Design a protein around this ligand. Structure first.
Ligand SMILES: Cc1cnc2c(cnn2CC(=O)O)c1
Lengths: 153, 39
């Protein structure tokens, strides 16, 4: 199947028509997405099959064909870009200054951008084009807006 | 069975639309991978 680096839509034909359930990143021969998008299921790419290789429900991440390859991190100061891939819509870069998720185990970057549920797995990038994490696991704050963690393996 | 479709290159876009705020929120992460607001 298609193994060229890039951003991809995760689709299913089990529901009505073709529905986009999420997004992922192909890099160095490994496909990276969020666990809640595929639930660890195998994926089809053309005539080929991608099998899960590593996953963890608590991190909400899964990799296929090999181990997690994305190791860039937000520097805590600079603006980033959400390369949003919404259902039925073209990939679009949105620039933002991340906020912070303060946890008992440390801090995590957060992006306050609202997109449909099937945009989960869209990569967040630094100025150099490196994926610093995936968008799609976060919280709904006081006045119904969405804030996603910058989730990295 | 789920399938993947290419959607684009991963590149920084010079002069992209800049939006969104930077909130600082206290959160908890449970065993199910769900984030919640600590109050
Ligand atoms: C990307 C994303 C994912 N889930 C979201 C949002 C906003 N609310 N939710 C909850 C849900 O629809 O289940 C955005």
């Amino acid at each position: 199947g298609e193994t060229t680096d890039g951003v991809y839509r995760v689709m299913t034909r089990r529901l009505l028509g073709s529905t986009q359930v999420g997004v992922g990143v192909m890099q160095e021969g490994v496909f990276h997405t969020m666990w809640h998008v595929t639930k660890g299921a195998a994926l089809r790419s053309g005539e080929g099959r991608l099998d899960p290789y590593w996953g963890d429900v608590k991190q909400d991440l899964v990799s296929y064909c090999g181990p997690w390859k994305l190791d860039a991190a937000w520097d805590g100061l600079s603006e980033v870009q959400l390369l949003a891939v919404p259902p039925g819509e073209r990939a679009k870069n949105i620039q933002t200054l991340p906020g912070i998720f303060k946890t008992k185990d440390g801090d995590i970057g957060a992006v306050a951008l609202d997109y449909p549920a099937g945009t989960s797995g869209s990569p967040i990038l630094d100025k150099c084009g490196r994926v610093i994490g995936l968008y799609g696991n976060g919280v709904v704050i006081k006045n119904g807006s969405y804030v996603s963690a910058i989730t990295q393996g | 069975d789920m399938y993947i479709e290419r959607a684009g290159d991963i590149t920084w876009e010079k002069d992209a639309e800049v939006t969104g705020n930077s909130p600082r929120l206290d959160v908890a992460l449970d065993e199910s991978g769900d984030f919640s607001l600590v109050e």
